[PDB]
Amino acid sequence: GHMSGEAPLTATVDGIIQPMLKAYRIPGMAVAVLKDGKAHYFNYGVANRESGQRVSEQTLFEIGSVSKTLTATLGAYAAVKGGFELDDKVSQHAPWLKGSAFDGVTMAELATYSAGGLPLQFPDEVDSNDKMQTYYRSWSPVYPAGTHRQFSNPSIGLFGHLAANSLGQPFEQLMSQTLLPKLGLHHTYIQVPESAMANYAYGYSKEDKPIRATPGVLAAEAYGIKTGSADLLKFVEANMGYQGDAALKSAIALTHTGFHSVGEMTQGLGWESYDYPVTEQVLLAGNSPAVSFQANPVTRFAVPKAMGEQRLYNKTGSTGGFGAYVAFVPARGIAIVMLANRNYPIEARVKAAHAILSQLAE
Ligand SMILES: *C(=O)[C@](NC(=O)Cc1cccs1)(OC)[C@@H]1N=C(C(=O)O)C(=C)CS1
Ligand code: NA
Ligand SMILES: [Zn+2]
Ligand SMILES: [Zn+2]
Ligand SMILES: [Zn+2]
Ligand SMILES: [Zn+2]
Ligand SMILES: [Zn+2]
Ligand SMILES: [Zn+2]
Fold it and tell me: Among 3, 195, 230, 257, which residue's beta carbon has the most beta carbons within 10 A?
């Protein structure tokens, strides 16, 4: 429909989301959108299947790799505050990495998954800090630095860890005591406090059992965040146009810089972006396993470039029991957050988000 208003918007969102929840047996979903910069909220189903607690915009969901947009923002903030420069070698900020392959990898390459084939996940027995250091010290590059994109927890994890260390504070502390309060995200956590536990959904695994994320090496950096639709939309709004702390503004802007592309997707700090308008087929391809999660040679940029407001920025994320998607278009005043307590197919996330974004654009 080519008309706007509360009536067509609700017809579209309910019409897109309700069938999808049935098709994938999603217990609960929180959805929030921006249109002309104004927010609308839709909640469906249950946070906890046993208790029947209903999802609201306060329900906490694991957002998986969407956490990496906050990790990247924290890393950008530390760069703006002078802790490191993006072209710095990684071992300039980790004395224990001098004389390793990380003498030849930049902080930017580590943040953008282009260090040379760091894997999706740490090997299973890299499960302590000591083992982690040995792991990176001994790592042998699969590809030359800057040439290939391979999405990787170890890569963005180390970026966030070292960025925090450059300011002399642990990552979780910097996130919880500085980044989140300055962003005004008061119900967003890496470690959910006992007072907020009643709002934390359970995830429902592929075997249909309750599950939540567990501690792990660089888990905070790679997949640490639990949040609701209202807080996550607030973070989106800070990305649509932020006025305030100059340092935080600069940091957010730095997450909108493009470093290289794979096909029609441009990799920034945290956020991945597209042209806007963008077709459903392109958005699906950019988020498909072949592109998003396997090794690809990149189209290198001569210099990193501010991608600007006429872009669709996005990120997918998942954990064992949860499936999240966020997309926004700063110039157009439109965005979508979709948080669910099932890890359901990214293709379904993208098709639903595209359809809703097309109505928001009217
Ligand atoms: C981000 O969603 C992703 N996963 C996480 O951050 C959380 C985890 C899920 C399993 C172990 S940690 O970043 C690595 C996705 N994780 C996987 C994966 O299952 O290895 C993907 C293939 C998509 S990226
Ligand atoms: Na850390
Ligand atoms: Zn139209
Ligand atoms: Zn409304
Ligand atoms: Zn072990
Ligand atoms: Zn360290
Ligand atoms: Zn607070
Ligand atoms: Zn921007």
Answer: 257
